[PDB]
Amino acid sequence: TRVFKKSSPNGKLTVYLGKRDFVDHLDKVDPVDGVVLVDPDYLKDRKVFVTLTVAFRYGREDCDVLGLSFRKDLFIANYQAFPPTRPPTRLQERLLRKLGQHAHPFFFTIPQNLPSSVTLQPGPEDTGKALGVDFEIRAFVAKSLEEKSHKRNSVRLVIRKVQFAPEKPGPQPSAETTRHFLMSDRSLHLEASLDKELYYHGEPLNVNVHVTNNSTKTVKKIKVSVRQYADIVLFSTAQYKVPVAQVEQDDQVSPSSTFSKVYTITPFLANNREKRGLALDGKLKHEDTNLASSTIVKEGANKEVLGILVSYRVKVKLVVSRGGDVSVELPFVLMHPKPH
């Protein structure tokens, strides 16, 4: 068993914690249960507090030289470390025994009402840390919550909220439509489906696709894509959307003829480094990471007016001689399996 620790440049002020990431169950998440260490002769009378937030953020912390830091706090809380004022858990009590009487416990519970950590790919002409949403925890000592801070009086740390694959499967994803032209009852029905409603990152997706062409035209090409959809609710409702993997073939379907084939596709990052506005799961500081997991909402309506949200769909298109192209689309989910 190992535990993390972090300290102020004064040394005297230090904190300890046994986790960095926390798992959403759509009905709970494990509590924040940290401990803080300080011998008060440094502060000599000032009051010690620990503070929590989820912040929308933009721009790097490292001395960037342009307008930045468009902070909107999604949610905040504070708690008194000293003077003493729910009951301590296993690790908190063990840590007390380890550390001694200058170390003191603190506690938070995350509501069921806020997003996961996520970030967008910066452009080449943009600079610094592109916009994102972060979980952050910070402690400091002062005679009030209003007074100015100092480096020696404070310490800061970062954490994450995360989701995993549900246990229960669902219905098969498939889509069809009896499209037709204006000449007569002659028609161009189309159909397709995937392997499952769910996948893990790096899995291959098959698409079984069919066409019934009793129309006046010949189908000339086929195209298929999987597309990322992102939503933002900060003050406005807004949307952003990008195709992220795509495939094509020149299959033919003459009128009074029918055709079917299975195609396969694989989302991956390497080919899309440059696409400004592509979404990712939240890295800690600067690391590389996989494409953003599809976030799973609770069963209730709720409001979730908290910025970023995301999901994916496949789209299928028929390209036809002498006009009349037509398309269809279909959602699916994508996230990591639950760890052992």
Partner: antibody, heavy 119, light 107 residues
């Protein structure tokens, strides 16, 4: 599940001798490939490797420039070719796989061939 | 480089004994360590990873633990078919690093 190897023999140094290793039972885009070389009475060194999903390679210093690695998804197969052969590039060589998310040791192994090179 | 040294080199145990092998390092690493069995000339197979995660399909006789810079492979009961060399591997940074082999031999 299986891994496989190709190309070996005793060859005159300074040349090149291509290696190949085809996967079954798992997608190469979801996983990364390593090779390791082992010598008589001696342990086992990592030479180089590929991670398809990000598209990165790394090499041991004693093979930088001299060695090249590649793979293609069409065949779910890994390749490497290496050049300017020393005699002491003679060793057993191994093909091995891994989990991309997240690295947890070499969980399956190819047969592993002797490649020998000398005057 | 990340300097490795397993220990000891080789000691002999007839069927049944309790013994440890240790793998020592020039730097600390939280958990990024694993070890493998391998009869000579054949493919390596892992026993232990993350410094204490026993791989599935393994008899409970195997175990080990970390302490800072010091890693401790352990066997509680030496098996009659097991005896061979074994190898430690450490990987938090690239390039990865590995040991030198432990020629266990019956007597």
């Amino acid at each position: 599940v299986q891994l496989v190897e190709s190309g070996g023999g005793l060859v005159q140094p300074g040349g090149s001798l291509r290696l190949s290793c085809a996967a079954s039972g798992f997608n190469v885009y979801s996983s990364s490939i390593h090779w390791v070389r082992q010598a008589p009475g001696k342990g086992l060194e990592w030479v180089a490797s590929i991670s398809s999903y990000y598209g990165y390679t790394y090499y041991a210093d004693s093979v930088k420039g001299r060695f090249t690695i590649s793979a293609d998804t069409s065949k779910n197969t890994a390749y490497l070719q290496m050049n300017s052969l020393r005699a002491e590039d003679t060793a057993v060589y191994y093909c091995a796989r891994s989990r991309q998310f997240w690295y947890s040791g070499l969980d399956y192994w190819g047969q592993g061939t002797l490649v020998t090179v000398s005057s | 480089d990340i300097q490795m040294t397993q220990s000891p080199s080789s000691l002999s145990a007839s069927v049944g004994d309790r013994v440890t092998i240790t793998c020592r390092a020039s730097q600390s690493v939280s958990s990024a360590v694993a070890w493998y069995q391998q009869k000579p000339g054949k493919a390596p197979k892992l026993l232990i990873y993350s410094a204490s995660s026993l791989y599935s399909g393994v008899p409970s006789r195997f175990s080990g633990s970390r302490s800072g810079t010091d890693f401790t492979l352990t066997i509680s009961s030496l098996q009659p078919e097991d005896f061979a060399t074994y190898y430690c591997q450490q990987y938090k940074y690239v390039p990865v690093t590995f040991g030198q082999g432990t020629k266990v031999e019956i007597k």
